[PDB]
Amino acid sequence: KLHKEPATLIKAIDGDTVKLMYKGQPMTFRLLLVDTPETKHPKKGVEKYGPEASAFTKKMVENAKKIEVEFDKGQRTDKYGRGLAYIYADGKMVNEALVRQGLAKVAYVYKGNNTHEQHLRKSEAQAKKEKLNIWS
Ligand SMILES: Cc1cn([C@H]2C[C@H](OP(=O)(O)O)[C@@H](COP(=O)(O)O)O2)c(=O)[nH]c1=O
Ligand SMILES: [Ca+2]
């Protein structure tokens, strides 16, 4: 079983990337198992719902009393040095909130980091059934 560790928000970067102070050092975290539309890469442009996904995450972590990070059992950092985790705001998983709202798709089931994959997939099916945002 995984365990949550406290962290402090530094800054929300976009829908799936946030900077947190973790174990006293600043670190960029990438949300496990999700993909929010891009808003900074010239390759994709400013994809549809990018701005909305960014606003959602930002609102969620900024308004939180408590932020927690939960590493999975596989690799803890990507090739860019970003921590790969499930992030919680007042006990609510940001990763799931995004999928449930149709603001992210379940993606990158990578290097044994899939503990909450089923949980996420269920939320995604529900957002799809409801034709929300990305699925509209
Ligand atoms: C979520 C996640 C993303 N990534 C990588 C894959 C992609 O690399 P490439 O940049 O080579 O495509 C990129 C997707 O993140 P972004 O959605 O921030 O771009 O980060 C991982 O390596 N592991 C992961 O668990
Ligand atoms: Ca993304």
Nearest protein CA to atom 16 of ligand 1, as residue: 35
Query: How far is residue 82's CA from residue 49's CA, in Å, rounded to a whole number?
Result: 23
Query: How far is residue 19's CA from residue 3's CA, in Å, rounded to a whole number?
Result: 20
Q: Which of 33, 70, 77, 110 to mutate to test the pocket of ligand 1 (most atoms within 8 A of CB)?
A: 110
Catalytic member of 82, 96, 100, 124: 82
CATH topology of domain 1-136: OB fold (Dihydrolipoamide Acetyltransferase, E2P) (2.40.50)
Give Cβ neighbours of residue 36 (< 8 Å, ≥ 6 apart).
Answer: 14, 15, 16, 49, 50, 53, 54, 57, 98, 103, 104
Catalytic site residue 121? no
Q: Where do the structural domains in the chain lie, given as residue ranges?
A: 1-136
Burial class (CB in 10 A: 0-12, 13-18, 19+), 92: exposed
Work out which ligand 1 atom sits closest to the CA atom of 78.
22
CB neighbours of residue 136 within 10 Å: 10
Header resolution in angstroms: 1.7
Contact 106, 39 (CB under 8 A): no
Catalytic site residue 38? yes
User: Gaps in the chain (C–N > 2.5 Å) come after which residues?
Assistant: none
The length of the chain is 136
Interior/surface letters 23-49, b for 16+ CB within 10 angstroms, e for the rest = eeeebbbbbbbbbbbbbeeeeeeeeeb
| C-alpha to C-alpha distances, 93 to 48, 68, 81, 86, 136, nearest whole angstrom | 23, 9, 22, 7, 23
Is 14 annotated in some ligand binding site?
A: no
Exp. method: X-ray
CA-based nearest residue to 29, from 76, 64, 89: 76
Work out which ligand 1 atom sits closest to the CA atom of 38.
17
Is the CB of 84 within 6 Å of ligand 1?
Answer: yes
